[PDB]
Design a protein around this ligand. Structure first.
Ligand SMILES: *[C@@H]1O[C@H](CO)[C@@H](O[C@@H]2O[C@H](CO)[C@@H](O[C@@H]3O[C@H](CO)[C@@H](O)[C@H](O)[C@@H]3O)[C@H](O)[C@H]2NC(C)=O)[C@H](O)[C@H]1NC(C)=O
Ligand SMILES: *[C@@H]1O[C@H](CO)[C@@H](O[C@@H]2O[C@H](CO)[C@@H](O[C@@H]3O[C@H](CO)[C@@H](O)[C@H](O)[C@@H]3O)[C@H](O)[C@H]2NC(C)=O)[C@H](O)[C@H]1NC(C)=O
Ligand SMILES: *[C@@H]1O[C@H](CO)[C@@H](O)[C@H](O)[C@H]1NC(C)=O
Ligand SMILES: *[C@@H]1O[C@H](CO)[C@@H](O)[C@H](O)[C@H]1NC(C)=O
Ligand SMILES: *[C@@H]1O[C@H](CO)[C@@H](O)[C@H](O)[C@H]1NC(C)=O
Lengths: 452, 304, 452
């Protein structure tokens, strides 16, 4: 059954041990590659609770972010030493399996140490890891399975889902993607609109954009070649990246500040996942950075302080307890090198969603935080509308009740048969961090398929 | 009029029918005193002003041989609980399965040792099976006696200084907790007791289970409850075994602790608003083979 | 000099008395009308600190809201009994004069008790009150004067400013308006856009709106007569008003909940200031409300709990201390009857702003909270752009530093000579409540005319 060598005896920094079983180990990716997994059983009747797979995005970021900082069974306090149980953890009603993918991200690795990869290799490795998982934990094969993720996992999940659709042994019941990049074109366009309507562009810029990048009611912010149009888009990207805004939460503070000094030590922090404005001619500031020996570089999200999670996972007693080979180097939430060597292959998710919709057997939900700019809610609502599906319920808001504080609005929901779009009012890229309880209520009603 | 007892994390206490509550309890072992005299001690306990008792259920007292159970007359623990309820006393039940308590083999039946290498208080499959069977027998008897079902049982101990045991098995504790929740229901209030030092709570506490400590007059009270709060930031402070005296050993001089020293310490504990149980309130008797032992070997005498 | 009979001996509920002088009394409005004032001297060198007038909006709401709940020298804690000093109070560097206007609002009244009024009467009463103020406190006539307000005060302030411009005795140095309604047309249009780009409308509604309410790149959301267009606008207004959203802060909770039960007692709470969608045919739900004797009605902002401020101002010891005639009835932040009987006269603020810009002597700044829907930032940026002034600085973001937490973005600023537009990122209708410190830094740099 379960691999005793993977079970967690304890986790330092935690005063009281978990009441549910949790494993940490490796799943067989391609022969050289071995993905790092962290499975946490449900806190109530795990034997019969659905299995929910969680993948983070990037590309090149660890799925241990959603666990240790978003909806895992415990969260790292600011001291980076203590762990506090989360009353809003997703593991309260489901068995969640977090997978650091692809190889090289977090504690994942490969014999050949070839961190370079691509969409197809990542999808095949994820499928092989899922098969290994089901062979290592046969007792959960029957449990209802759901594939979830965030950001770049908006590509990963549906392509992998097509693979999942080819395996009758996996009890795929539905799928959910949070703030996923459905379409670079639809994302860039919705982003430009978002920026104008959120006071980020200005009327001068807006007028120039409409003049140099649009047909009458048609705007092209994806592959427009007009010179001044491209210049305006470059200015937009400058403002979004390095003017001080938090691309993950417009209305939130910036950890330590980005428009101040670039770095305080010889460690460079990169915050470009290279998934936005890819068809636009960017400036090669990467060669500007010193390439000399000993220049350590790490990939962290913009205005996000990854210190706490790193200091926890990199703590010798935690690494030991989590059965992590002492050989592997330090831990980061995102791997710079992985992102740099990543090869994007898919353009839009149209084919993937059409493949998933053709079976009409799975319940799918896409939810977006309304203050994100990396995968703004508008781009995903446009995508879903462009899917031209049968409308089952006209768009309306959904409510959530908090302790003795009346009903509150959590967002808006559009339901077509087997696929739904939903917004989370007030949440950023990491929806669980900004609206924990609302995230839990929506997740619970999704998993349980209870209509809103 | 519904009986709603639950821990008030906000106000660091218990709530009984919506009212703030903290208990002042004394330990009484119905088994170290003959049933003929149970009422007597319990009435004295009521007359002392205690509103709850903290008692152990010794597994070995009811199942001397596997599958043979004794529960009538002197063996009728359920009648003892009912009698306490009739006197207007609440009950804190401590069903083990290990109770220590200077009682034989910590309550565990000696026939468990028929497997020579078996391990007690661990994830040993045969141990866990036997524990489960014992719980499946004992706990349904306690279910109607739970406060929310109209009886006197308000909280339930799962272990006893588990941090002192070598195993440090959290799978074992999780298994116990799952079985207790299954047989008794989610409504029950579950707690632990350990020595008043974080090192023991390290291996004793557990999620979804309240954590408490024990300590006597030779412990920094502030430090002890700070240690508890490090594991329970919110909720009532609780000393489940505030030692009023101490056990004896043959040959070792009888332990004596001055009355008024205990009184002063008790007042100090009460002034913090905590929950305290006086271990022991009555000691009773070490019958034929019910005594325990320490290491290096030193059996406890007949007198308790 | 100062009127000893107006000085405040003390304020109950406050543990330590203010370190600055503060007066509370009445200013001569039109002979029957007597405005209620509350003057608070600067906390540092009041003799030479500028005088800043503060007016709230409505129409029919008390200017004591900005004081007791937004930027006054003290704030009412949730208990509605205790008063805590505010480290971010506007009175730290200026002498602020709060005026409850017009008559009937708060503690203002008139001999004839004619609460009905109009824009012109309110402006004349405000001017007469300012003259009385300067005659009651001659020592502050020399101090630099600034006219500030919020919401509906976006109309009040500039019209009154034209009057202020006719008095050489008033040392008008500049003016600032927070989230003001510059133009009902520009406001309704920007609101419809805001709603679509903030996920409030949906693609079905958006498409219908573009079809029935717009020319090609021209949309008419002000006086459009197209039937289905008007129906779509009515649905929009239904969603904004009574679907559960907070028109003052999209990203904030709703006090007690609006989509639950309408009321819990025989007190009806109205949240329509009747300034939005005025040219649209609304449903007469006011006659639906019982008109029987003893039906108490009060005007409170949507999802805003006015209990605390009322229980403070209505406390006998506070009313006594504040020299308020025991005759006057209970206190409310907004007066329903005043709003109902209010007569709007001005359509757009174009003429007022042109009158203020023609002198080119005053420094004017308009600041808008980016999460408000009553006077969204877009409508005011459009208005200001429509003013066709000389650009002095291209739009850019402005920063604010918090205690050991690096530089942060507070908004965007557009500067034309003598007039500036600014956004406050994360603030709602009551900017001081959502971003106290940022509000103070912007206010301080405005008053001191220090360029950002
Ligand atoms: C990211 O999170 C880490 C979490 O560890 C932060 O590190 C902690 O930062 C605080 C505040 O700077 C440090 O507290 C300071 O301690 C010194 C004494 O050493 C004291 O003089 C200061 O007044 C302050 O209290 C804390 O020591 C530090 N701990 C560790 C383990 O690094 C880090 O500051 C965060 N950075 C950003 C940009 O968010
Ligand atoms: C608006 O603000 C007022 C401020 O006074 C709120 O009134 C206060 O509301 C709280 C919470 O409902 C009351 O506390 C309650 O006290 C009772 C005992 O009386 C207790 O059983 C509850 O558990 C809770 O602690 C408080 O007494 C009350 N005080 C006053 C003077 O009214 C009001 O609730 C707020 N309403 C909204 C819709 O925001
Ligand atoms: C991904 O990389 C592997 C490396 O061998 C390569 O074989 C494969 O063709 C790549 N994917 C695509 C779509 O070319
Ligand atoms: C207990 O320890 C705390 C701090 O460790 C100290 O303040 C207190 O005086 C001590 N009290 C006793 C009785 O030891
Ligand atoms: C405002 O009301 C007064 C009431 O007498 C009236 O005289 C005045 O004309 C009104 N304003 C306008 C612009 O008509």
């Amino acid at each position: 059954s379960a691999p005793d060598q993977d079970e967690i005896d304890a986790l330092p920094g935690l005063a009281k041990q978990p009441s549910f079983r949790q494993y940490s180990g490796y799943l067989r990716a391609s022969d050289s590659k071995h993905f790092h997994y962290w499975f946490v059983e449900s806190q109530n009747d795990p034997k019969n609770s659905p299995v929910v797979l969680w993948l983070n995005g990037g590309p090149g970021c660890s799925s241990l972010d959603g666990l240790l900082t978003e909806h895992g069974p415990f969260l790292i306090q600011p001291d980076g030493v203590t762990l506090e149980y989360n009353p809003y953890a997703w593991n309260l009603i489901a068995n969640v399996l977090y997978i650091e993918s692809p190889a090289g991200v977090g504690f994942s690795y490969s014999d050949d140490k070839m961190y370079v990869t691509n969409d197809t290799e990542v999808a095949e490795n994820n499928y092989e890891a899922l098969k290994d998982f089901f062979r290592l934990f046969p007792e959960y094969k029957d449990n209802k399975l759901f594939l979830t993720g965030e950001s770049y996992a908006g590509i990963y999940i549906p392509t992998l889902a097509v693979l999942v659709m080819q395996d009758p042994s996996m009890n795929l019941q539905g799928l959910a993607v949070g703030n996923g990049l459905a379409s670079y074109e639809q994302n860039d366009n919705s982003l430009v609109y978002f920026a104008y309507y959120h006071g980020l562009l200005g009327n001068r810029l807006w007028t120039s954009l409409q003049t140099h990048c649009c047909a009458q009611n048609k705007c092209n912010f994806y592959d427009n070649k007009d010179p001044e149009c491209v210049n305006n888009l470059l200015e937009v990207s400058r403002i979004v990246g390095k003017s001080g805004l938090n691309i993950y939460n417009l209305y939130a503070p910036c950890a330590g500040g980005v428009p101040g000094r670039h770095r305080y030590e010889d460690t460079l922090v990169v915050q470009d996942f290279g998934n936005i404005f890819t068809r636009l001619p960017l400036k090669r500031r990467f060669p500007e950075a010193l390439m000399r020996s000993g220049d350590k570089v790490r990939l962290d999200p913009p205005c996000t302080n990854t210190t706490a999670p790193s200091n926890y996972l990199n703590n010798p007693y935690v690494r030991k307890a989590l059965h992590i080979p002492e050989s592997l180097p330090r831990w980061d939430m995102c791997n710079f090198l992985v992102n740099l060597q990543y090869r994007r292959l898919y353009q839009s998710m149209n084919s993937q969603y059409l493949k998933l919709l053709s079976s009409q057997k799975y319940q799918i939900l896409l939810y977006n935080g309304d203050v994100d700019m990396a995968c703004n809610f508008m781009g995903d609502e446009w995508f879903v509308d462009s899917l031209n599906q049968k409308m089952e319920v006209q768009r309306r808001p959904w409510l959530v009740d908090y302790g003795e504080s009346g009903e509150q609005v959590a967002g808006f929901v559009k339901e077509c048969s087997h696929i739904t779009f939903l917004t989370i009012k007030g949440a950023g890229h990491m929806v669980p961090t900004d609206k924990p309880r609302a995230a839990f209520t929506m997740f619970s009603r999704f998993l349980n398929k209870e209509p809103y | 009029t519904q009986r709603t007892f639950k821990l008030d994390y906000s106000r660091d206490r218990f709530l009984k029918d919506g009212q703030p509550f903290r208990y002042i309890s004394g330990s009484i072992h119905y088994f170290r005193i003959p049933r003929f005299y149970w009422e007597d001690r319990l009435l004295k306990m009521k007359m002392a002003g205690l509103n709850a008792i903290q008692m152990y259920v010794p597994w070995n007292f009811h199942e001397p041989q596997p599958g043979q159970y004794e529960f009538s007359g002197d063996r009728d623990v359920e009648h003892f609980i009912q009698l306490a309820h009739e006197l207007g006393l609440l009950v804190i039940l401590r069903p083990g399965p290990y109770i220590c308590a200077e009682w034989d083999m910590g309550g565990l039946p000696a026939w468990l040792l028929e497997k020579q290498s078996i391990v007690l208080r661990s994830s040993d499959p045969d141990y866990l099976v036997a524990v489960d069977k014992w719980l499946a027998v004992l706990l349904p008897k306690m279910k109607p006696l739970l406060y929310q079902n109209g009886g006197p049982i308000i909280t339930v101990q799962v272990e006893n200084e588990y941090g002192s045991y070598f195993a440090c098995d959290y799978d074992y504790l999780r298994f116990l907790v799952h079985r207790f929740r299954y047989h008794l229901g989610n409504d029950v209030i579950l707690f632990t007791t350990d020595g008043a030092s974080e090192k023991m709570l390290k291996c004793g506490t557990l999620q979804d289970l309240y954590a408490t400590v024990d300590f006597g007059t030779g412990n920094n009270i502030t430090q002890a409850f700070l240690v508890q709060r490090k594991f329970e930031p919110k909720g009532p402070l609780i000393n489940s075994e505030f030692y009023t005296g101490w056990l004896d050993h043959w040959g070792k001089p009888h332990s004596t602790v001055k009355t008024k020293t205990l009184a002063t310490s008790l007042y100090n504990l009460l002034a913090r608003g905590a929950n305290v149980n006086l271990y022991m309130f009555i000691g009773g008797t070490n019958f034929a083979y019910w005594n325990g032992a320490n290491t290096p070997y030193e059996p406890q005498p007949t007198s308790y």
